[PDB]
Amino acid sequence: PRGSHMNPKRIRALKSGKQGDGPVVYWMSRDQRAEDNWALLFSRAIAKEANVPVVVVFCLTDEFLEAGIRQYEFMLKGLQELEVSLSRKKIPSFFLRGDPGEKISRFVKDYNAGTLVTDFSPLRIKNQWIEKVISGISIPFFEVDAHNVVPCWEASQKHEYAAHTFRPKLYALLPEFLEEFPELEPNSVTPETLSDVLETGVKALLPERALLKNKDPLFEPWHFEPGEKAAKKVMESFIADRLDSYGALRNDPTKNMLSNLSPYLHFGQISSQRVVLEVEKAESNPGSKKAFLDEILIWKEISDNFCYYNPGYDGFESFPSWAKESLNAHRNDVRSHIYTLEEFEAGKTHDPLWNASQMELLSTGKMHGYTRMYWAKKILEWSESPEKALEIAICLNDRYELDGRDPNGYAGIAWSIGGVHDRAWGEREVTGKIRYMSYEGCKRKFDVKLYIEKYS
DNA sequence: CGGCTCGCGCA
DNA sequence: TGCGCGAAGCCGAT
Numbered sequence: 313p314r315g316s317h318m319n320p321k322r323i324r325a326l327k328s329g330k331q332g333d334g335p336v337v338y339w340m341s342r343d344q345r346a347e348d349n350w351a352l353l354f355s356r357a358i359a360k361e362a363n364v365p366v367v368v369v370f371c372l373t374d375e376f377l378e379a380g381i382r383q384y385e386f387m388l389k390g391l392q393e394l395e396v397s398l399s400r401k402k403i404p405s406f407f408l409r410g411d412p413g414e415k416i417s418r419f420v421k422d423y424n425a426g427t428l429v430t431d432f433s434p435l436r437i438k439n440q441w442i443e444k445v446i447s448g449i450s451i452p453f454f455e456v457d458a459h460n461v462v463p464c465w466e467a468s469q470k471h472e473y474a475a476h477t478f479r480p481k482l483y484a485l486l487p488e489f490l491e492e493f494p495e496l497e498p499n500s501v502t503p504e505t506l507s508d509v510l511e512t513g514v515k516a517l518l519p520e521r522a523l524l525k526n527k528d529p530l531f532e533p534w535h536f537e538p539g540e541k542a543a544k545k546v547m548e549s550f551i552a553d554r555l556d557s558y559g560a561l562r563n564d565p566t567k568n569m570l571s572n573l574s575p576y577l578h579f580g581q582i583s584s585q586r587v588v589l590e591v592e593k594a595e596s597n598p599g600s601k602k603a604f605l606d607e608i609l610i611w612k613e614i615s616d617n618f619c620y621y622n623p624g625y626d627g628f629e630s631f632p633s634w635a636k637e638s639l640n641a642h643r644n645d646v647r648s649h650i651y652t653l654e655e656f657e658a659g660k661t662h663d664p665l666w667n668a669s670q671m672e673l674l675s676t677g678k679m680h681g682y683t684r685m686y687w688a689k690k691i692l693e694w695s696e697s698p699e700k701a702l703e704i705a706i707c708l709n710d711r712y713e714l715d716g717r718d719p720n721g722y723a724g725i726a727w728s729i730g731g732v733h734d735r736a737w738g739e740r741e742v743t744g745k746i747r748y749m750s751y752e753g754c755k756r757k758f759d760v761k762l763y764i765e766k767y768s
Numbered sequence: 769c770g771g772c773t774c775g776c777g778c779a
Numbered sequence: 780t781g782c783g784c785g786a787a788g789c790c791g792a793t
């Protein structure tokens with residue numbers, strides 16, 4: 313659909329039909345940003361070719377009732393800043409509430425939309441909303457992958473077993489898809505309140521707030537300033553101050569050596585392609601640059617590949633055959649300790665290292681990448697069954713992580729519990745051939761006393 | 769057949 | 780801390 317700096321492989325048709333005479337409607341869900349957004353850039357080009365304006369619609373669902381205030385407040389502040397950003401580009405942002413399957417379809421008829429465009433995501437709830445919209449609309453419906461550098465359906469056409477099989481496929485398509493972003497052109501033709509939806513949502517999530525003994529909330533909201541502008545500043549600080557030592561202090565939770573981009577990368581407040589662009593041109597350590605590029609390209613996008621080709625990505629069935637047979641044979645193995653969901657949530661286990669990992673999750677909403685493995689693998693070692701371990705790990709991850717309800721989470725949990733994108737290891741009790749990690753192994757890699765003392 | 773994103777013994 | 784090895788099942792390049 314026209315465009316010079318626009319690769320058509322980033323778009324795909326969801327429903328054919330006659331193009332209406334109305335403006336182009338962008339159903340922004342996953343990539344909540346104005347700059348470096350293919351789904352918005354493609355929506356502007358179609359609008360320019362049809363001599364119509366472009367509008368942005370966001371549907372707020374009841375999904376926030378499953379999470380807490382930490383994710384609702386982080387995402388809502390970004391949309392308030394996003395509202396002003398599109399206003400400067402003469403693009404109006406319309407915020408709806410309810411089921412997108414009925415709210416978007418009613419929107420299309422009411423506003424007399426001519427073309428509908430949405431961003432891509434492999435989650436189950438989005439494939440459902442899309443199909444309900446398809447049955448209720450009669451205009452063309454497009455979908456753009458503005459989250460992955462290479463489109464998910466283009467990098468691979470199947471579920472990738474391991475990264476060493478996905479690495480050469482992704483890196484072979486980098487010279488084509490890794491490109492600069494054209495600027496967003498404001499509209500030529502011009503045509504509720506977010507403050508009220510924020511106050512209404514917080515009042516409903518108040519009883520479920522995580523508290524201390526003295527009724528003092530646990531979440532510390534000053535660690536990550538939300539929004540598109542603050543996401544850019546985090547990237548600049550990481551490249552200038554943290555990219556050099558990234559390859560050596562990657563797995564040390566006592567050091568703040570990570571990029572801290574996942575809360576912004578999840579909500580779409582920042583483009584991973586933009587991060588990859590800035591990293592490629594920076595002069596830094598080559599082992600550090602390779603280590604970071606493998607994280608944000610190979611492993612961030614193979615998580616989308618995992619969810620796109622495995623609909624049960626959050627279930628025991630998605631595990632490989634060797635893992636399922638191994639964990640099934642150890643179901644009757646006596647376990648050293650049995651902790652319920654409440655004991656894991658409050659951090660009341662016998663392991664001070666595990667409790668400290670949960671404390672960081674409860675206080676900052678973002679646990680260190682290395683400790684997230686020990687946090688999830690010890691849940692499997694201290695649960696009733698593999699199904700309960702998957703249930704508990706997903707519950708705490710999606711409730712308290714600022715990057716929860718993400719394909720990176722379900723792939724990361726399935727990696728730690730089900731050996732997805734992993735291999736077999738030494739045979740043990742309970743866990744079987746799943747990769748084992750011990751408290752003593754962490755003692756030889758970093759100062760565990762500092763990490764425990766930092767979070768009680 | 770070669771090589772995959774732990775623990776462990778040893779400088 | 781940094782390195783080489785062990786224990787394990789399977790992809791995929793042929």
Ligand SMILES: Cc1cc2nc3c(=O)[nH]c(=O)nc-3n(C[C@H](O)[C@H](O)[C@H](O)COP(=O)(O)OP(=O)(O)OC[C@H]3O[C@@H](n4cnc5c(N)ncnc54)[C@H](O)[C@@H]3O)c2cc1C
Pocket residue numbers: 570571572573574575577578607608611612615679680681682684685688709713715716717718720721722724725727728
């Ligand atoms: C059990 C488990 C659960 C996880 N839960 C989530 C989750 O809900 N949301 C989430 O965003 N990440 C999750 N991950 C991945 C990883 O823990 C985080 O992406 C990372 O810790 C975020 O911190 P960072 O951005 O500073 O990391 P950095 O080292 O700065 O990494 C930069 C980016 O690379 C990507 N990345 C890094 N490590 C991974 C990984 N292992 N898998 C996939 N992408 C990765 C992320 O997009 C991240 O923002 C989980 C991993 C595990 C093992």
